[PDB]
C-alpha cells in the first residue's frame, strides 16, 4: 500500500482494509526511508507487538506544509473537509517525500 | 501580596522592536525562574521563553532568535525586548511565576501589546446619556461610546469605579487605524440623574484621561 | 517539538454534568517519572490560574472539581460537577521539552437555560448633536444563547451602514452573554424621521424584539 | 462594484525583513465561513501569477515566502524573507461580487546599496543627420536610488524642447535602475555648436554626471 | 503543455470590429474558464469578464454591448470578439485560467490591441554605437534604437535572443501615432568593434525585422 502506483486523492482517500496477516512495525520505524513517523495513543517501539481486530491504510498525498495537520484534533482545509482524523485515533501516521 | 503586571508599550509598527517592564512582587527572582507568555493570537495559547534562576534561559523555536529575556535581579523586575512583531502577535503578554515540576502558579494581569502600522490616537469620549424623555422601572442602565482610539486596551469605569453591581466590558471594533468601545452599567434610579454621574475613560496606551458628565 | 492537539474546540455543559476537555500528545515520556502534564485556565473576565499540576493533583484557590489524568498521548481533564466558574479556555503544557507550547485551548461554554437579552436604548449626547454626528446604541445583555442578530430599520429605510457589533464571551462567574449594537451617524439622520426601531431576533424571544426610540428623546 | 482600498500604495523594504501589505475591502461577509480574498504579483513586463488564494492557502509554482491572512475586511500579504528578486507590484482580487476588480496596487522595491551610473553616449547614424534630424542616445544605467535629474543643456543654453527620458524601475534580475535619455534636435542645431553636453546630477554624487559628444562623431 | 497565448491583432482603425483569439492548452476547457482583463490603465488591473464552466459569462456594465467572449469547446480556443472600437479604446487583453474560488491560476502572454485612425507605420531601426569619447572599464555598452515604430508590441534582441541577462529593456515614449523604444546590451569591452555584434528587431504588427550590426 506504501509503494503502490498511485494513490488517491485527499478527498476519496483509499481505505484498504486488512486483517488476518502479521504486520512488523519496528522494522519500518527503523527503516530510514520515512521523512514522519509520528504515532497517537502508543510509541512505534512498543505497538510493533499487539493483536487488533482490523487496521486500515488511508492512501493519499498533501504537501509539505500540510503533513502536520494530519494529527486528531488538529484543524486545516484537509483536517475538516477532505480527511477527517479521529479525535481518539490509537494508531499512526506515516509520511515520506 | 503577589505582582506580575506588565507596562512600558503604548503601540509599535509591524517589523520594529520594542521593551516591557514586568513589576515582581511575592517572590524573590532569585527563588524562582520568571516565565513568558502571550494571550491567544489566534490559535491556542503561545509560550516565549523563561528565565531560569541565576542561570540561562530557554526560548521557544520560533521566538528564540527573535525575543529575548532580560532578568533585572537587582530591581526586582524582568524587562522583555522583542523583535520582528507582526499584527498576528497582538495578545496580553504575562508573566508567571515558576512552579515544582517547571508549572505556572502565580499569573499576573499583563498588557496587550498591538502591533499595528497605524499611529496612536487618544480617545474622543461621547457619553451615552438617555434623554429627558427616557423612563425608568426601579433601576436605570448607562454606559459610553469611547470611539477613536488606537491602540488597545481601554477601561471605562463609572465614577472612577464605584459601581460593581451590574458592571459589563464588551470587546474594541477594529475601525479603520482606530477602535470603537461601548459599555453598559446597571444602576439604582436613585443615583441618577440625582446624584453627579460622570463616566471615567482611561488610555493606558497615550496615559489619557477623559472625564464626561453622563 | 510537541503538538498539543488539544479537542474539542469547544464544549456546551450545562450545570451540575460532567464536562470533558481531551487534550492530544506526540511527546514526551518521564515528565518526573510519568508521562503526565499541567493544566490551565484563562478567564474572558479574571486573569489565568492554575488548575492542576501533573494532571492528578489539586492546586490552592480552585476548586477540587477539576480533576482527570492522562496517558503518553491521551489526557483528560474531567471537571464534575459544572458550576458557574468554568465559563474559559482551558489549556494543557508540557514541560519536558522546549518549546513548552500549551494546547489549542477547548472553550467552555456553560450551557444554562436560555434567557431572553435585556432591553436600554441610548440617544446621542449633547456634544455629540452639537458636533453634526449622531450615534444610538441599543444593548441587548443577559442572554443565552450567543446567538443574536440586530437589525437596525429606520422608519424611512433600513440602515446597515455604520452598524457594529460588540460580541462579549461568557463571563467566568456570569453565565450570561451580553452584545452591544451601535449605529454611528449624523444629526440629520437622527433628526430625519420621529421614531425608529431596532429589531432584533433572538432564539429566546419567539417573538420579534422590537423597541423604537423617538429623535425627541434629548 | 466594491473598490478594494488596498493600502500602501508603494513599499521600500530592505534586504531580510518582512513586507505587509493591506488590501481593504467593504463587501460581502460571510459567503461560506469567510471573506476572503486572493492575491497577485504583476511584474514590471510580465502579467500576474497567483500567490495566495482566500488568503490562507499556499500556491505551488511561486516562491514559498509568500503568505497571509486577513480579516472579513482587511486583508494582509505577508513576504518573508524579502530578497533581490521581489521587484514587483502586488494587487488583491474581488471574488464574492461581481465584478472580479482589484485594488489600488502596491508597488513594492528591494532597498539595495547606493551605485553611481555608467558613463556614455550614442551618436546617431548617418542616415538619420542626413534626413535632417538627430537621435543622440545618453544611458545612465546601473545605479541606486532613482532619485536623479536628468536634463540635456546644449553649449548654448538649457535645452527645454529635445529633453526626453525612458525609465526603467527597479527589474527582477536587475535590482538597479537604469534611464536612457534622447536628444531631439535637427541637423543644423545637432552641428549648430562643437561639443554638447549631457548632464545629470545623482543623489549621492554632488558632482554632475556628464558625458559630452561633438558633432563629428559619426 | 499550457499555452494561452494571443494572436490576430496588429492595428485597428476607429469604427471597426475584431475578435482576438487566445489558444488554450494544457487544461480541459471544459472543466475551467477563460478569463479576460486589460494591463491596468490608469488605476489598478482592470477585469473585463470570464465565461463560466458550461454556464453564463460576465462582463462590466461599460463593455456588456462592445465587448463578448465565445469559449469554442471542440477547438479549445476561446474568442474575444471586439465591436465598436474607437481611438480611446485602447487596451492590453490577457488570458488566464479559473481556479477553484474564482481564482487566475494560470496566465498568458497577451495582445496590444492599439485603436487608431493612422495607418501602420514600421520601424526605423539605427544601431547605438558608443562615440570615440566613450570610454570602457571592461564592460562596453551597445544598443539598437528602434524609433518611429507603430503600434505595439515590438521586441528587440541581441543574436535573436542568444543574451538575455546582459539585454537591458525601456519604456518606450508615447507619441503622436508613434513610439520610440531604447535598448542597451551589455558585453566586455574586448568584443566590439572585434567581434559581429547583430542586432534583431521583431514588431509582430507589421511583421517587419530589420537586422542592423552595431
Known amino acids: 500500500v506504501f509503494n503502490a502506483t498511485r494513490f488517491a486523492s485527499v478527498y476519496a482517500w483509499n481505505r484498504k482494509r486488512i486483517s488476518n496477516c502479521v504486520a512488523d512495525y519496528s522494522v519500518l520505524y527503523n527503516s530510514a526511508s520515512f521523512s514522519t513517523f509520528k504515532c497517537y495513543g502508543v510509541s512505534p517501539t512498543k505497538l510493533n507487538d499487539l493483536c487488533f481486530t482490523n487496521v486500515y491504510a488511508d492512501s493519499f498525498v498533501i504537501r509539505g506544509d500540510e503533513v502536520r495537520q494530519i494529527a486528531p484534533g488538529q484543524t486545516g482545509k484537509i483536517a475538516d473537509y477532505n480527511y477527517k482524523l479521529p479525535d481518539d485515533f490509537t494508531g499512526c501516521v506515516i509520511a515520506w517525500n | 501580596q503577589v505582582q506580575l503586571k506588565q507596562s512600558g508599550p503604548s503601540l509599535v509598527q509591524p517589523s520594529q522592536s520594542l521593551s516591557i517592564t514586568c513589576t515582581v512582587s511575592?517572590?524573590?527572582?532569585?527563588?524562582?525562574?520568571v516565565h513568558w507568555v502571550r494571550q491567544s493570537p489566534g490559535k491556542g495559547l503561545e509560550w516565549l521563553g523563561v528565565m531560569w534562576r541565576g542561570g540561562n534561559t530557554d526560548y521557544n523555536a520560533a521566538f528564540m532568535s527573535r525575543l529575548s529575556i532580560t532578568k533585572d535581579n537587582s530591581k526586582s523586575q524582568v524587562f522583555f525586548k522583542m523583535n520582528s512583531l507582526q499584527t498576528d502577535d497582538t495578545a496580553i503578554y504575562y508573566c508567571?511565576?515558576?512552579?515544582?515540576?517547571?508549572?505556572?502558579?502565580?499569573w499576573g494581569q499583563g498588557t496587550s501589546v498591538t502591533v499595528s502600522s497605524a499611529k496612536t490616537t487618544p480617545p474622543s469620549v461621547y457619553p451615552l446619556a438617555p434623554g429627558s424623555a427616557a423612563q425608568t422601572n426601579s433601576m436605570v442602565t448607562l454606559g459610553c461610546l469611547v470611539k477613536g482610539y488606537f491602540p488597545e486596551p481601554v477601561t471605562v469605569t463609572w465614577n472612577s469605579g464605584s459601581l460593581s453591581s451590574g458592571v459589563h466590558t464588551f470587546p474594541a471594533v477594529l475601525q479603520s487605524d482606530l477602535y470603537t468601545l461601548s459599555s453598559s452599567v446597571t444602576v439604582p434610579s436613585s443615583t441618577w440623574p440625582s446624584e453627579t454621574v460622570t463616566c471615567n475613560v482611561a488610555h493606558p496606551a497615550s496615559s489619557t484621561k477623559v472625564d464626561k458628565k453622563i | 517539538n510537541i503538538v498539543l492537539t488539544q479537542s474539542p474546540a469547544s464544549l456546551a455543559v450545562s450545570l451540575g454534568q460532567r464536562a470533558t476537555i481531551s487534550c492530544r500528545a506526540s511527546?514526551?515520556?518521564?515528565?518526573?517519572?510519568?508521562?503526565?502534564l499541567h493544566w490551565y485556565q484563562q478567564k474572558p473576565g479574571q486573569p489565568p490560574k492554575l488548575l492542576i499540576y501533573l494532571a492528578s493533583n489539586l492546586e490552592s484557590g480552585v476548586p477540587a472539581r477539576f480533576s482527570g489524568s492522562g496517558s503518553r498521548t491521551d489526557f483528560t481533564l474531567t471537571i464534575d460537577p459544572v458550576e458557574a466558574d468554568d465559563a474559559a479556555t482551558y489549556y494543557c503544557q508540557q514541560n519536558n521539552e522546549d518549546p513548552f507550547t500549551f494546547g489549542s485551548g477547548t472553550k467552555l461554554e456553560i450551557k444554562r437555560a436560555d434567557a431572553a437579552p435585556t432591553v436600554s436604548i441610548f440617544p446621542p449626547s449633547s456634544e455629540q448633536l452639537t458636533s453634526g454626528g449622531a450615534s444610538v446604541v441599543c444593548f441587548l445583555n443577559n442572554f443565552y444563547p450567543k446567538d443574536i442578530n440586530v437589525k437596525w430599520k429606520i422608519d424611512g429605510s433600513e440602515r446597515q451602514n455604520g452598524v457594529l457589533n460588540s460580541w462579549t464571551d461568557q463571563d467566568s462567574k456570569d453565565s450570561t452573554y451580553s452584545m452591544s449594537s451601535t449605529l454611528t451617524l449624523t444629526k440629520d439622520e437622527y433628526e430625519r424621521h420621529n421614531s425608529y426601531t431596532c429589531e432584533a431576533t433572538h432564539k429566546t424571544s419567539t417573538s420579534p424584539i422590537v423597541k423604537s426610540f423617538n429623535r425627541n428623546e434629548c | 462594484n466594491i473598490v478594494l482600498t488596498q493600502s500602501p500604495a508603494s513599499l521600500a523594504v530592505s534586504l531580510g525583513q518582512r513586507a505587509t501589505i493591506s488590501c481593504?475591502?467593504?463587501?460581502?461577509?460571510?459567503?461560506?465561513?469567510?471573506?476572503?480574498?486572493?492575491?497577485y504579483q504583476q511584474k514590471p513586463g510580465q502579467p500576474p501569477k497567483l500567490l495566495i488564494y482566500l488568503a490562507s492557502n499556499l500556491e505551488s509554482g511561486v516562491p514559498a515566502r509568500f503568505s497571509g491572512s486577513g480579516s472579513r475586511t482587511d486583508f494582509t500579504l505577508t513576504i518573508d524573507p524579502v530578497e533581490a528578486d521581489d521587484a514587483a507590484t502586488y494587487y488583491c482580487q474581488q471574488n464574492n461580487e461581481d465584478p472580479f476588480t482589484f485594488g489600488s496596487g502596491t508597488k513594492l522595491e528591494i532597498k539595495r546599496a547606493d551605485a553611481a551610473p555608467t558613463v556614455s553616449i550614442f551618436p546617431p547614424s548617418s542616415e538619420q543627420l542626413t534626413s535632417g534630424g538627430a537621435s543622440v542616445v545618453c544611458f545612465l544605467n546601473n545605479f541606486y536610488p532613482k532619485d536623479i535629474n536628468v536634463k540635456w543643456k546644449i553649449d548654448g543654453s538649457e535645452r527645454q524642447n529635445g529633453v526626453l527620458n525612458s525609465w526603467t524601475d527597479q527589474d527582477s534580475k536587475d535590482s538597479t535602475y537604469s534611464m536612457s535619455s534622447t536628444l531631439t534636435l535637427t541637423k543644423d542645431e545637432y552641428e549648430r555648436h562643437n561639443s554638447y553636453t549631457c548632464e545629470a546630477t545623482h543623489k549621492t554624487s554632488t558632482s554632475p554626471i556628464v558625458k559630452s559628444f561633438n558633432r563629428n562623431e559619426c | 503543455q499550457v499555452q494561452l497565448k494571443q494572436s490576430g491583432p496588429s492595428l485597428v482603425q476607429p469604427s471597426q470590429s475584431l475578435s482576438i483569439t487566445c489558444?488554450?492548452?494544457?487544461?480541459?476547457?471544459?472543466?475551467?474558464?477563460?478569463?479576460?482583463v486589460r494591463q491596468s490603465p490608469g488605476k489598478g488591473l482592470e477585469w473585463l469578464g470570464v465565461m463560466w464552466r458550461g454556464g453564463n459569462t460576465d462582463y462590466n456594465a461599460a463593455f456588456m454591448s462592445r465587448l463578448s467572449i465565445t469559449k469554442d469547446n471542440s477547438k479549445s480556443q476561446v474568442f474575444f470578439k471586439m465591436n465598436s472600437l474607437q481611438t480611446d479604446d485602447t487596451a492590453i487583453?490577457?488570458?488566464?485560467?479559473?481556479?477553484?474560488?474564482?481564482?487566475?491560476?494560470?496566465?498568458?502572454?497577451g495582445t496590444s490591441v492599439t485603436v487608431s485612425s493612422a495607418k501602420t507605420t514600421p520601424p526605423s531601426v539605427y544601431p547605438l554605437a558608443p562615440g570615440s569619447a566613450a570610454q570602457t572599464n571592461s564592460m562596453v555598452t551597445l544598443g539598437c534604437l528602434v524609433k518611429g515604430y507603430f503600434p505595439e508590441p515590438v521586441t528587440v534582441t541581441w543574436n535573436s535572443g542568444s543574451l538575455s541577462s546582459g539585454v537591458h529593456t525601456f519604456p518606450a515614449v508615447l507619441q503622436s501615432d508613434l513610439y520610440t523604444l531604447s535598448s542597451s546590451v551589455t558585453v566586455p569591452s574586448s568584443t566590439w568593434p572585434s567581434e559581429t555584434v547583430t542586432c534583431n528587431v521583431a514588431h509582430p504588427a507589421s511583421s517587419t525585422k530589420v537586422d542592423k550590426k552595431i
Open positions: 508567571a511565576k515558576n512552579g515544582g515540576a517547571h508549572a505556572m502558579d502565580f
Open positions: 511527546e514526551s515520556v518521564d515528565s518526573y517519572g510519568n508521562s503526565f
Open positions: 511575592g517572590f524573590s527572582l532569585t527563588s524562582y525562574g
